[PDB]
């Protein structure tokens, strides 16, 4: 079985959430590849199937549990299991379609959605943009329930899509970015639920580009600046990896490190 990390929203604290995100990062990366102090996820090329996924078992105060599957190559959610049913996002290619056959192999009912898990598509289905979907422990608690009840007709598709958006940001994006982990820690600390501000949204949108810019940099210096947003929506440019070391925790593999 793939590695399993457990988290519950029931009585969650800053520390329990922090322990969780740190454990997820530890199972996503091996320590083999660290560039400018930033870990790089395993290269998909040649990655054995037995090392391809990790599992995040989420429980809530309602005593419901679901298990998300994350791809180690990008830290993103590929599907989930609840009881006797499992659901997978539409795969991008045949290799990924084959790979997900190795997940939740004893589940009685397996389904693949016709839609992918990218935000553009999930927002369309949810009927809301990320800027209008609240995040926090309550939202996560609710998301777990919604995912749990999908197979029995209890959850409408827009609510399912919204629930994925919540889970992906609070787990995948938090694993990818200390900054986003921090944003979720704050919501937990004060029991606040609020939508992500522009700084969070723009970081999420830029993860792939930041990964490439860092890995292809000249001694850390970007050939082309990357524009991000502040919390108030104002734009600024990033010219160097240095300022991102406290912000980005994981990068997708883009190229081999230079000699």
């Amino acid at each position: 079985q793939y590695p399993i990390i457990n988290f519950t929203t029931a009585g969650a604290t800053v520390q329990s959430y922090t322990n969780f995100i740190r454990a997820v990062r530890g199972r996503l990366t091996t320590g083999a590849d660290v560039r400018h102090e930033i870990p790089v996820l395993p290269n998909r090329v040649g990655l054995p199937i037995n090392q391809r996924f990790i599992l995040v078992e989420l429980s809530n105060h309602a005593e419901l549990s679901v298990t998300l599957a994350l791809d180690v190559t990008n830290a993103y959610v590929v599907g989930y299991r609840a009881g006797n049913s499992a659901y997978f996002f539409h795969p991008d290619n045949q290799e990924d379609a084959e790979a997900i056959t190795h997940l939740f192999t004893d589940v009685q009912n397996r389904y693949t959605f016709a839609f992918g898990g990218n935000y553009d598509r999930l927002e369309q289905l949810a009927g809301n943009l990320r800027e209008n979907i609240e995040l926090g422990n309550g939202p996560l608690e609710e998301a777990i329930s919604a995912l749990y009840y999908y197979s029995t007709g209890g959850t409408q598709l827009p609510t399912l899509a919204r629930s994925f958006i919540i889970c992906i940001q609070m787990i995948s994006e938090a694993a990818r970015f200390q900054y986003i982990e921090g944003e979720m820690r704050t919501r937990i600390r004060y029991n606040r639920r609020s939508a992500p501000d522009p700084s969070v949204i723009t970081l999420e949108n830029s993860w792939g580009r930041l990964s490439t810019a860092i890995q292809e940099s000249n001694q850390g210096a970007f050939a082309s600046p990357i524009q991000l947003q502040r919390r108030n929506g104002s734009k600024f440019s990033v010219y160097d990896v240095s300022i991102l070391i406290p912000i980005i925790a994981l990068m997708v593999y883009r190229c081999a490190p230079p000699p």
């Binding site: 991000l228 947003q229 502040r230 600024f236």
Partner: peptide, 6 residues
């Protein structure tokens, strides 16, 4: 080092 975004 999050002051970057404030």
């Amino acid at each position: 080092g999050f002051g970057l975004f404030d």
